């Protein structure tokens, strides 16, 4: 956990997130929808288990991005929930929920669900 | 289960589903987006635990509706997963996933998630 989590991670689509894992279980960093532009970077914050079990278990973690920055506001927020798995081929396997602000009539279509794997290796 | 499940159920929005629970764990019936029109009725099929546990547990079940009938095709399917709970105020508490057919570029927005409670009482 901690030292293993801090770093740059890439998913299958080409998105980048840069995270620092703090000693007291805090995650802070930025998500970039594309590898090189300020207009596509968004703030993230989250938490992780800072004393994970000593058998071969993953480290549980989660984070949120609200999709507003200085250039764009998409009136929506995503949360990722998953676990870090260390070793030679470190990865974070996640499921995610994306909620949009809706009217009450449209609330049934407010939330999408999907899944994402992050690796330290950009392919 | 079975005899308790067979019947008409209503959710909070005003949708109706009519289901027969067969002796060998089959569910068959129709979902109606609104209480009185053929253009809004769709076929459902599903399965349930036909020998549930004898302590106070719910009966696990699930069903699928593909949103195509003789009048409309919305190129999408929903599955409901949950459990029947019997008694004086019988209900089926569900979570659901709605998937639309997408192009591969748009596959990230293909699936919505929500939840629904069905009661035998229309309010």
């Amino acid at each position: 956990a901690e030292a293993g989590i801090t770093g740059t991670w890439y998913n299958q689509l080409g998105s980048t997130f840069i995270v620092t894992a703090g000693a007291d279980g805090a995650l802070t960093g930025t998500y970039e929808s594309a590898v090189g532009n300020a207009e596509s970077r968004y703030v993230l914050t989250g938490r992780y288990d800072s004393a994970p079990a000593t058998d071969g278990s993953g480290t549980a973690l989660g984070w949120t991005v609200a999709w507003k920055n200085n250039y764009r506001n998409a009136h929506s927020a995503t949360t990722w929930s998953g676990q870090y798995v260390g070793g030679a081929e470190a990865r974070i396997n996640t499921q995610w929920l994306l909620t949009s602000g809706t009217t009450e009539a449209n609330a049934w279509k407010s939330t999408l669900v999907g899944h994402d794997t992050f690796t330290k290796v950009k392919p | 289960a079975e005899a308790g499940i067979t019947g008409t159920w209503y959710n909070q929005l005003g949708s109706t589903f009519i289901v027969t629970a067969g002796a060998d764990g089959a569910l068959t019936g129709t979902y109606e987006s609104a209480v009185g029109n053929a253009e809004s009725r769709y076929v459902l099929t599903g399965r349930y635990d036909s020998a549930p546990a004898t302590d106070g547990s719910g009966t696990a079940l699930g069903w699928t509706v593909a949103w195509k009938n003789n009048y409309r095709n919305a190129h999408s399917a929903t599955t409901w997963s949950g459990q029947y709970v019997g008694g004086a105020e019988a209900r089926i508490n569900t979570q659901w996933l709605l998937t639309s057919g997408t192009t591969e570029a748009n596959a990230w927005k293909s699936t919505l998630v929500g939840h629904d409670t069905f009661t035998k009482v229309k309010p």
């Binding site: 689509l13 991005v65 999709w67 994306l98 | -």
Partner: peptide, 6 residues
């Protein structure tokens, strides 16, 4: 496209 994706 949503910024999570582009």
């Amino acid at each position: 496209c949503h910024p999570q994706f582009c």
